[PDB]
Amino acid sequence: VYLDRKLLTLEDKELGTVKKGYYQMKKVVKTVAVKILKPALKDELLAEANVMQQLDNPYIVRMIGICEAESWMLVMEMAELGPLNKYLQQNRHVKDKNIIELVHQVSMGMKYLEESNFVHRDLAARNVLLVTQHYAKISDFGLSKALRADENYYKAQTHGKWPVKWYAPECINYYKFSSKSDVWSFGVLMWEAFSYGQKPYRGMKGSEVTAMLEKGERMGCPAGCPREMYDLMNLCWTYDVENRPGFAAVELRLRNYYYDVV
Numbered sequence: 503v504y505l506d507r508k509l510l511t512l513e514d515k516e517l518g519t520v521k522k523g524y525y526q527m528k529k530v531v532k533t534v535a536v537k538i539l540k541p542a543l544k545d546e547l548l549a550e551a552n553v554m555q556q557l558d559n560p561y562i563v564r565m566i567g568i569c570e571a572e573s574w575m576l577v578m579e580m581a582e583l584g585p586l587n588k589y590l591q592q593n594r595h596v597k598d599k600n601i602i603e604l605v606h607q608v609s610m611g612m613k614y615l616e617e618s619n620f621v622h623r624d625l626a627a628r629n630v631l632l633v634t635q636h637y638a639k640i641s642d643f644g645l646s647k648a649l650r651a652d653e654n655y656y657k658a659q660t661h662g663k664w665p666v667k668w669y670a671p672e673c674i675n676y677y678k679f680s681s682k683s684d685v686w687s688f689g690v691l692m693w694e695a696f697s698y699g700q701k702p703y704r705g706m707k708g709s710e711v712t713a714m715l716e717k718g719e720r721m722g723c724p725a726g727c728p729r730e731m732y733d734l735m736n737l738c739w740t741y742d743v744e745n746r747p748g749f750a751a752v753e754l755r756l757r758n759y760y761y762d763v764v
Protein backbone atom coordinates (compact mmCIF):
# COMPACT_ATOMS: atom_id res chain seq x y z
CA VAL A 503 0.00 0.00 0.00
CA TYR A 504 3.05 2.35 0.15
CA LEU A 505 3.33 5.08 -2.48
CA ASP A 506 6.46 6.67 -3.94
CA ARG A 507 6.96 10.37 -3.07
CA LYS A 508 8.87 11.36 -6.25
CA LEU A 509 5.81 10.15 -8.23
CA LEU A 510 3.44 12.47 -6.26
CA THR A 511 3.02 16.14 -7.18
CA LEU A 512 0.93 18.44 -4.96
CA GLU A 513 -0.56 21.83 -5.84
CA ASP A 514 0.40 24.47 -3.33
CA LYS A 515 -2.89 25.67 -2.14
CA GLU A 516 -5.04 23.65 0.21
CA LEU A 517 -8.55 22.82 -0.78
CA GLY A 518 -7.12 18.05 8.19
CA THR A 519 -5.16 19.81 5.54
CA VAL A 520 -6.07 18.49 2.18
CA LYS A 521 -4.32 19.27 -1.07
CA LYS A 522 -4.84 18.50 -4.70
CA GLY A 523 -2.17 16.45 -6.37
CA TYR A 524 -1.22 14.33 -9.26
CA TYR A 525 0.32 10.95 -8.86
CA GLN A 526 1.95 9.10 -11.70
CA MET A 527 0.74 5.54 -11.75
CA LYS A 528 1.98 3.25 -14.48
CA LYS A 529 1.70 5.00 -17.85
CA VAL A 530 -0.68 7.78 -16.75
CA VAL A 531 -1.24 10.31 -14.03
CA LYS A 532 -4.16 10.14 -11.68
CA THR A 533 -5.63 13.22 -10.09
CA VAL A 534 -5.68 12.91 -6.30
CA ALA A 535 -6.63 14.57 -3.03
CA VAL A 536 -4.10 14.04 -0.31
CA LYS A 537 -4.57 14.33 3.38
CA ILE A 538 -1.48 15.85 4.91
CA LEU A 539 -0.64 15.67 8.59
CA LYS A 540 0.74 18.40 10.87
CA PRO A 541 3.12 12.89 17.91
CA ALA A 542 0.11 10.54 18.44
CA LEU A 543 -1.94 11.74 15.41
CA LYS A 544 0.33 9.52 13.25
CA ASP A 545 -1.60 6.45 14.47
CA GLU A 546 -4.97 8.17 13.81
CA LEU A 547 -4.12 8.79 10.14
CA LEU A 548 -2.97 5.17 9.69
CA ALA A 549 -6.16 3.95 11.42
CA GLU A 550 -8.19 6.02 8.90
CA ALA A 551 -6.22 4.44 6.01
CA ASN A 552 -6.74 0.97 7.51
CA VAL A 553 -10.51 1.60 7.45
CA MET A 554 -10.52 2.98 3.89
CA GLN A 555 -8.33 0.06 2.74
CA GLN A 556 -11.09 -2.37 3.80
CA LEU A 557 -13.92 -0.52 1.99
CA ASP A 558 -14.90 -1.05 -1.65
CA ASN A 559 -18.17 0.55 -2.80
CA PRO A 560 -19.07 3.03 -5.62
CA TYR A 561 -20.35 5.66 -3.15
CA ILE A 562 -17.25 5.78 -0.92
CA VAL A 563 -14.03 7.69 -1.63
CA ARG A 564 -11.35 5.13 -2.54
CA MET A 565 -7.90 5.42 -0.97
CA ILE A 566 -5.02 5.09 -3.47
CA GLY A 567 -2.44 4.57 -0.73
CA ILE A 568 -0.26 6.06 1.96
CA CYS A 569 2.89 8.05 1.60
CA GLU A 570 5.57 8.27 4.23
CA ALA A 571 7.46 11.31 3.33
CA GLU A 572 7.84 14.82 4.41
CA SER A 573 4.58 14.67 6.40
CA TRP A 574 2.52 11.54 6.63
CA MET A 575 0.08 11.54 3.76
CA LEU A 576 -3.14 9.75 2.80
CA VAL A 577 -3.67 9.78 -0.99
CA MET A 578 -7.22 9.47 -2.31
CA GLU A 579 -8.96 9.65 -5.64
CA MET A 580 -10.06 13.12 -6.54
CA ALA A 581 -13.68 14.15 -6.69
CA GLU A 582 -13.63 17.34 -8.72
CA LEU A 583 -16.91 19.04 -7.74
CA GLY A 584 -16.12 18.89 -3.97
CA PRO A 585 -18.38 18.96 -0.84
CA LEU A 586 -22.16 18.63 -1.30
CA ASN A 587 -23.07 21.53 1.00
CA LYS A 588 -20.92 24.15 -0.77
CA TYR A 589 -21.95 22.85 -4.21
CA LEU A 590 -25.67 23.19 -3.46
CA GLN A 591 -24.98 26.61 -1.89
CA GLN A 592 -23.52 27.79 -5.23
CA ASN A 593 -26.04 25.93 -7.45
CA ARG A 594 -29.50 26.82 -6.10
CA HIS A 595 -30.86 25.74 -9.52
CA VAL A 596 -30.31 22.03 -8.66
CA LYS A 597 -33.63 20.16 -8.72
CA ASP A 598 -35.13 18.20 -5.82
CA LYS A 599 -35.06 15.04 -8.00
CA ASN A 600 -31.27 15.50 -8.36
CA ILE A 601 -30.94 15.95 -4.54
CA ILE A 602 -32.94 12.76 -3.98
CA GLU A 603 -30.63 10.94 -6.40
CA LEU A 604 -27.61 12.18 -4.47
CA VAL A 605 -28.85 11.47 -0.91
CA HIS A 606 -30.06 8.04 -2.04
CA GLN A 607 -26.53 7.30 -3.27
CA VAL A 608 -25.27 8.31 0.17
CA SER A 609 -27.76 5.83 1.73
CA MET A 610 -26.39 2.99 -0.48
CA GLY A 611 -22.86 3.83 0.61
CA MET A 612 -24.05 3.92 4.24
CA LYS A 613 -25.98 0.64 3.84
CA TYR A 614 -22.72 -0.98 2.68
CA LEU A 615 -20.96 0.57 5.69
CA GLU A 616 -23.58 -0.87 8.05
CA GLU A 617 -23.35 -4.35 6.41
CA SER A 618 -19.56 -4.11 6.91
CA ASN A 619 -20.10 -3.20 10.62
CA PHE A 620 -18.23 0.12 10.43
CA VAL A 621 -19.55 3.34 12.01
CA HIS A 622 -18.64 6.59 10.24
CA ARG A 623 -19.24 8.95 13.25
CA ASP A 624 -18.94 12.11 11.11
CA LEU A 625 -21.68 11.88 8.48
CA ALA A 626 -22.49 15.40 7.29
CA ALA A 627 -23.05 17.16 3.97
CA ARG A 628 -19.48 18.55 4.19
CA ASN A 629 -18.20 14.93 4.01
CA VAL A 630 -20.17 14.03 0.88
CA LEU A 631 -18.11 14.68 -2.23
CA LEU A 632 -19.42 15.00 -5.75
CA VAL A 633 -17.60 13.20 -8.55
CA THR A 634 -20.19 14.65 -10.94
CA GLN A 635 -23.54 16.42 -10.28
CA HIS A 636 -25.17 12.94 -10.35
CA TYR A 637 -22.57 10.96 -8.38
CA ALA A 638 -21.75 11.39 -4.68
CA LYS A 639 -19.15 9.65 -2.50
CA ILE A 640 -18.82 9.53 1.28
CA SER A 641 -15.48 10.86 2.56
CA ASP A 642 -13.62 11.55 5.85
CA PHE A 643 -13.23 8.31 7.74
CA GLY A 644 -11.00 9.97 10.40
CA LEU A 645 -13.53 9.19 13.15
CA SER A 646 -14.72 5.82 11.79
CA LYS A 647 -14.61 2.63 13.89
CA ALA A 648 -14.85 -1.04 12.98
CA LEU A 649 -17.40 -2.68 15.29
CA ARG A 650 -16.54 -5.81 17.24
CA ALA A 651 -18.23 -8.98 16.03
CA ASP A 652 -20.18 -9.29 19.33
CA GLU A 653 -21.32 -5.62 19.65
CA ASN A 654 -23.47 -3.22 17.61
CA TYR A 655 -21.96 0.01 19.03
CA TYR A 656 -18.66 1.73 19.76
CA LYS A 657 -18.21 3.38 23.20
CA ALA A 658 -16.07 6.56 23.27
CA GLN A 659 -13.99 7.42 26.36
CA THR A 660 -14.62 11.17 26.67
CA HIS A 661 -16.27 14.02 24.75
CA GLY A 662 -13.63 15.33 22.28
CA LYS A 663 -14.07 17.97 19.56
CA TRP A 664 -17.40 16.56 18.34
CA PRO A 665 -19.78 17.68 15.56
CA VAL A 666 -22.58 17.84 18.13
CA LYS A 667 -25.21 19.00 15.64
CA TRP A 668 -25.00 15.72 13.65
CA TYR A 669 -24.97 13.43 16.71
CA ALA A 670 -27.88 11.43 18.11
CA PRO A 671 -28.86 11.83 21.82
CA GLU A 672 -27.36 8.45 22.77
CA CYS A 673 -23.98 9.63 21.38
CA ILE A 674 -24.13 12.85 23.44
CA ASN A 675 -25.50 11.21 26.62
CA TYR A 676 -23.89 7.73 26.67
CA TYR A 677 -21.01 8.05 24.15
CA LYS A 678 -22.61 5.17 22.16
CA PHE A 679 -22.08 5.14 18.39
CA SER A 680 -23.91 2.65 16.18
CA SER A 681 -25.10 2.52 12.59
CA LYS A 682 -28.38 3.87 13.98
CA SER A 683 -26.52 6.98 15.19
CA ASP A 684 -25.14 7.40 11.66
CA VAL A 685 -28.84 7.30 10.60
CA TRP A 686 -29.50 10.32 12.83
CA SER A 687 -26.59 12.13 11.16
CA PHE A 688 -27.99 11.07 7.79
CA GLY A 689 -31.22 12.84 8.78
CA VAL A 690 -29.29 16.07 9.45
CA LEU A 691 -27.42 15.51 6.16
CA MET A 692 -30.74 15.27 4.32
CA TRP A 693 -31.91 18.50 6.01
CA GLU A 694 -28.69 20.16 4.78
CA ALA A 695 -29.12 18.91 1.24
CA PHE A 696 -32.72 20.05 0.81
CA SER A 697 -31.79 23.40 2.38
CA TYR A 698 -29.11 23.81 -0.33
CA GLY A 699 -26.23 23.61 2.12
CA GLN A 700 -27.58 25.79 4.95
CA LYS A 701 -26.13 25.00 8.38
CA PRO A 702 -28.39 23.01 10.73
CA TYR A 703 -29.54 24.60 14.02
CA ARG A 704 -28.22 27.98 12.86
CA GLY A 705 -26.87 30.24 15.62
CA MET A 706 -27.38 27.59 18.34
CA LYS A 707 -24.70 26.18 20.66
CA GLY A 708 -24.45 22.40 20.92
CA SER A 709 -25.88 22.50 24.44
CA GLU A 710 -28.99 24.33 23.17
CA VAL A 711 -29.48 21.84 20.30
CA THR A 712 -29.32 19.01 22.85
CA ALA A 713 -31.95 20.73 25.03
CA MET A 714 -34.17 21.33 21.95
CA LEU A 715 -34.06 17.62 20.98
CA GLU A 716 -34.67 16.60 24.60
CA LYS A 717 -37.95 18.62 24.47
CA GLY A 718 -39.12 16.61 21.43
CA GLU A 719 -38.36 19.40 18.98
CA ARG A 720 -36.76 19.00 15.56
CA MET A 721 -35.72 21.17 12.61
CA GLY A 722 -38.40 22.37 10.18
CA CYS A 723 -39.11 21.31 6.60
CA PRO A 724 -36.85 23.13 4.12
CA ALA A 725 -38.52 25.29 1.46
CA GLY A 726 -39.62 23.07 -1.40
CA CYS A 727 -38.56 19.83 0.31
CA PRO A 728 -40.68 16.85 -0.79
CA ARG A 729 -42.97 15.88 2.11
CA GLU A 730 -41.88 12.22 1.89
CA MET A 731 -38.22 13.33 2.34
CA TYR A 732 -39.08 15.49 5.32
CA ASP A 733 -40.99 12.61 6.86
CA LEU A 734 -37.89 10.45 6.33
CA MET A 735 -35.72 13.03 8.20
CA ASN A 736 -38.08 12.85 11.17
CA LEU A 737 -37.91 9.07 11.11
CA CYS A 738 -34.10 9.37 11.12
CA TRP A 739 -34.52 11.64 14.18
CA THR A 740 -36.28 8.97 16.27
CA TYR A 741 -35.03 9.51 19.87
CA ASP A 742 -35.12 5.85 20.91
CA VAL A 743 -32.29 3.93 19.18
CA GLU A 744 -34.28 0.67 18.85
CA ASN A 745 -37.24 2.25 17.03
CA ARG A 746 -35.05 4.35 14.70
CA PRO A 747 -34.54 2.60 11.33
CA GLY A 748 -31.26 1.11 10.15
CA PHE A 749 -29.80 2.01 6.76
CA ALA A 750 -31.39 -0.93 4.89
CA ALA A 751 -34.82 0.48 5.78
CA VAL A 752 -33.68 4.04 4.99
CA GLU A 753 -32.10 3.04 1.64
CA LEU A 754 -35.24 1.05 0.69
CA ARG A 755 -37.51 4.02 1.40
CA LEU A 756 -35.26 6.35 -0.61
CA ARG A 757 -34.95 3.93 -3.53
CA ASN A 758 -38.72 3.35 -3.80
CA TYR A 759 -39.42 7.08 -3.56
CA TYR A 760 -36.65 7.95 -6.10
CA TYR A 761 -37.84 5.30 -8.61
CA ASP A 762 -41.50 6.36 -8.22
CA VAL A 763 -40.69 10.10 -8.75
CA VAL A 764 -38.43 9.58 -11.82
Ligand SMILES: Cc1cn(-c2nc(Nc3cc(C)c(OS(C)(=O)=O)c(C)c3)ncc2F)cc1CN1CC[C@@H](O)C1
Binds near residue numbers: 517535578588628629
Ligand atom coordinates in the same frame (compact mmCIF):
# COMPACT_ATOMS: atom_id res chain seq x y z
C1 LIG B 1 -10.47 13.97 3.96
C2 LIG B 1 -10.84 14.65 2.65
C3 LIG B 1 -10.81 14.09 1.44
N1 LIG B 1 -11.19 15.02 0.54
C4 LIG B 1 -11.35 14.89 -0.79
N2 LIG B 1 -11.76 15.97 -1.51
C5 LIG B 1 -11.97 15.92 -2.84
N3 LIG B 1 -12.40 16.98 -3.57
C6 LIG B 1 -12.42 18.27 -3.17
C7 LIG B 1 -12.60 19.25 -4.16
C8 LIG B 1 -12.62 20.61 -3.83
C9 LIG B 1 -12.80 21.62 -4.98
C10 LIG B 1 -12.50 21.02 -2.49
O1 LIG B 1 -12.47 22.36 -2.12
S1 LIG B 1 -13.65 23.18 -2.11
C11 LIG B 1 -14.00 23.66 -0.43
O2 LIG B 1 -14.82 22.47 -2.73
O3 LIG B 1 -13.36 24.42 -2.90
C12 LIG B 1 -12.32 20.03 -1.50
C13 LIG B 1 -12.17 20.39 -0.02
C14 LIG B 1 -12.30 18.68 -1.84
N4 LIG B 1 -11.80 14.74 -3.48
C15 LIG B 1 -11.41 13.65 -2.84
C16 LIG B 1 -11.18 13.68 -1.47
F1 LIG B 1 -10.80 12.56 -0.85
C17 LIG B 1 -11.47 16.15 1.21
C18 LIG B 1 -11.26 15.96 2.51
C19 LIG B 1 -11.44 17.01 3.61
N5 LIG B 1 -12.83 17.03 4.11
C20 LIG B 1 -12.89 17.88 5.32
C21 LIG B 1 -13.84 19.02 4.98
C22 LIG B 1 -14.76 18.38 3.97
O4 LIG B 1 -15.34 19.39 3.15
C23 LIG B 1 -13.78 17.60 3.13
